[PDB]
Structures are given as C-alpha cells and as structure tokens.
Amino acid sequence: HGSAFNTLVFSDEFEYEGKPDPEKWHYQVIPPNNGSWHNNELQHYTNRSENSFVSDGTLKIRAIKEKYTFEGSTKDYTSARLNSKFAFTYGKVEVRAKLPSKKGTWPAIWTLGANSNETGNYFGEQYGNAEWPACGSIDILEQNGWDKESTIAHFHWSDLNSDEYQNLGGTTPITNASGSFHVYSLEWNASAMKVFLDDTLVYELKNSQNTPYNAPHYLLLNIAMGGTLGGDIPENFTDDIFEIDYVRIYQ
Ligand SMILES: OC[C@H]1O[C@@H](O[C@H]2[C@H](O)[C@@H](O)[C@H](O[C@@H]3[C@@H](O)[C@@H](O)O[C@H](CO)[C@H]3O)O[C@@H]2CO)[C@H](O)[C@@H](O)[C@@H]1O
Ligand SMILES: [Ca+2]
Structure with missing residues (x-):
C-alpha cells in the first residue's frame, strides 16, 4: 500500500539533541479560546524543554x-503542540511512535x-x-484517555458548497501502543x-473537489490532557510521554 508516493519532501529523523x-517545527503557545484550548482541554502548551525535547534518536x-499561567490564564497541566513548517497537498505521511500509556x-x-488561520499558527492568512x-x-x-487498546482515525470538514459539518471515521485495535513502536500513516x-x-486500514474517505482536501495542509503533533477525548485524569498523574522516532512525508 502507498508505494506510488516515493519522493521524500519533508522529514525529521530526530537524530540530533535539544529543541525540535x-x-x-513551530510551537503553539497562545491559547485560541479566551485563555483555553478547545474541547474543554485542561493543558497549556509551551515551548519549554519540560514539554518537548529530542534525544537518543527520538522526539x-x-x-x-x-500549574502554569500564560497571560492571566492558569492551567493545571502543560504539554506541547507542534506544527510542521511545511505545508503540502497530497502525499504519504508516516510517523513511527510510542503513545502515552496513562x-x-x-x-x-x-x-x-x-488556510485555517488558527491563532498562533505558522501560516496565518497566507x-x-x-x-x-x-x-x-x-x-x-x-x-482517547480511557481506552489505550484502540486507535482512532477521523476526518472533520465542511463541504465547500455548504456550512454542513461532517465528522466521520473509524477505530482499530492496537496492542502495546505505549511499549512498542507502530507506524501511523496517511496516503x-x-x-x-x-x-x-501499520498495514491495517483504519478508514478511507473518498476525495472530491467539494472537500477541503485539495489544498495544502500542515501536520500537528500534541498531547492534550482531559477534555472530550482525554476524559478524567487520575489525581496521581505526574507526567507522560509521546515518543516519535521519525516523521516522513513523500509525494
Ligand atoms: O469550537 C469553535 C472553534 O473551533 C476551532 O476548531 C477546533 C475545534 O473546536 C476542535 O473540536 C478541534 O479538535 C480536534 C479534533 O477535531 C480532531 O481533529 O483531533 C484534534 C486532535 O486531537 C482535536 O484537537 O480542533 C479545531 C482546531 O483547533 C476553531 O479553530 C475556532 O475558530 C472555533 O472558534
Ligand atoms: Ca529517529
């Protein structure tokens, strides 16, 4: 599957030490929603070494x-939210990673x-x-936070010729997501x-000109805490890691 996408256009093998x-990579740190992120999430995102770092061949x-305060807004968790400084239309994206267990x-x-123009992103209104x-x-x-034995793939869009919000996708079982690398990919x-x-299709969505999937997109990598899909966080939570061996994009 995906062999047609064979020209490497962007990658990070993470073989260096220090900041991404x-x-x-661009960091988002400014909350988009009056001092908060979306989805009722509980974190701030920062560009500090507390929340992201590259060492030993992985991000x-x-x-x-x-506790962390940004511009008068205090939250009880910190994390990082990276955006690629690379926007692309069509391709094969491969990310080999170990997921948080907690x-x-x-x-x-x-x-x-x-064209999202999301607050604090890299592209603005370009x-x-x-x-x-x-x-x-x-x-x-x-x-999600409560079922580490399945993964989710899911599309969110409105048709170009409607305000009609669409959200659909699938899930698939996964074993040892936190202790074993898997490859998560898009073609x-x-x-x-x-x-x-890996080689299991999670979901396939037919493309058409009435979707926003024929113009450039950028990649995001993050850990949110709580909110819609994070759910309840144990009182004892200390910290957890999302470990990424590489990002590769082919066209
Ligand atoms: O709620 C109104 C705001 O929506 C912002 O877009 C958010 C959207 O609210 C949020 O649900 C969505 O969440 C993402 C999921 O759709 C999915 O793709 O997975 C992501 C990773 O887990 C998850 O964050 O994110 C949208 C983009 O941040 C609008 O940007 C904002 O203008 C509007 O007021
Ligand atoms: Ca690596």
Whole structure:
C-alpha cells in the first residue's frame, strides 16, 4: 500500500539533541479560546524543554501536572503542540511512535488545512481564512484517555458548497501502543484519503473537489490532557510521554 508516493519532501529523523529543529517545527503557545484550548482541554502548551525535547534518536512530547499561567490564564497541566513548517497537498505521511500509556492523555497526529488561520499558527492568512472545520482536518492518529487498546482515525470538514459539518471515521485495535513502536500513516491523493495503523486500514474517505482536501495542509503533533477525548485524569498523574522516532512525508 502507498508505494506510488516515493519522493521524500519533508522529514525529521530526530537524530540530533535539544529543541525540535526550528526550521521544521513551530510551537503553539497562545491559547485560541479566551485563555483555553478547545474541547474543554485542561493543558497549556509551551515551548519549554519540560514539554518537548529530542534525544537518543527520538522526539518526546511530555505532558506534566504542573500549574502554569500564560497571560492571566492558569492551567493545571502543560504539554506541547507542534506544527510542521511545511505545508503540502497530497502525499504519504508516516510517523513511527510510542503513545502515552496513562489515563487522561489524548495524543494526536493530525492535519489542518493551511488556510485555517488558527491563532498562533505558522501560516496565518497566507492561503486564506477558512475557520475550522472549513479548512479541513485529517486525524492520522488519536487515542482517547480511557481506552489505550484502540486507535482512532477521523476526518472533520465542511463541504465547500455548504456550512454542513461532517465528522466521520473509524477505530482499530492496537496492542502495546505505549511499549512498542507502530507506524501511523496517511496516503492522500485527489482520489482518496487512507489512514493506516501499520498495514491495517483504519478508514478511507473518498476525495472530491467539494472537500477541503485539495489544498495544502500542515501536520500537528500534541498531547492534550482531559477534555472530550482525554476524559478524567487520575489525581496521581505526574507526567507522560509521546515518543516519535521519525516523521516522513513523500509525494
Ligand atoms: O469550537 C469553535 C472553534 O473551533 C476551532 O476548531 C477546533 C475545534 O473546536 C476542535 O473540536 C478541534 O479538535 C480536534 C479534533 O477535531 C480532531 O481533529 O483531533 C484534534 C486532535 O486531537 C482535536 O484537537 O480542533 C479545531 C482546531 O483547533 C476553531 O479553530 C475556532 O475558530 C472555533 O472558534
Ligand atoms: Ca529517529
């Protein structure tokens, strides 16, 4: 599957030490919603070494129970939310990773249309100003906080010719998501978007010109805490890691 996408256009093998490469990765830190993130999430996102770092051939994003204030808004958790400094239309995205094991964590590998104009993102209004869900988004991987034995792939968009919000996708079983690397991938072209866990198709959505999936998207990597899909966080939560061996994008 996906062999047609064979020209490497972007990658990070994470073989260096220190901050995620600033030529490749942009941090979001400004909350988009009056001092909070969306989905009733409980974290702030920071660009500190507490919450992301590269060492030993892998990127780690680390969520921590920690009081933290940004511009008058205090939250009880910190994490990181990275965006690629690379926007693309169509391709094969491969991310090899180990997921957080702890309850309450909501990791994600996903995309937004580069016309999102999301607050504090890297692209602003360069491509347009299509507020989510009109910019489109593809989940390559999410896990909720209460079931670490399944993964989620899910699309969110509004049709170009309607305000009608669409949200659909699938799930698949996973074994040892936290202790064993798996490859989470997307194959995206003018015909279809296919999300895989290793070689299992999680979901395929037919593409068309009436979707926002024919213009550039950028990649996001994050751990949210709590909220819709994070759920209740144990009182004893300390910290947890989302470990990414590499990101590769082919066209
Ligand atoms: O609620 C109104 C605001 O929506 C913002 O877009 C958010 C949206 O609210 C939120 O539900 C969505 O959450 C993502 C899921 O759809 C999915 O793709 O997985 C992501 C990773 O787990 C998850 O964060 O995110 C949208 C983008 O941040 C609008 O941006 C905002 O203008 C509007 O007021
Ligand atoms: Ca690596």
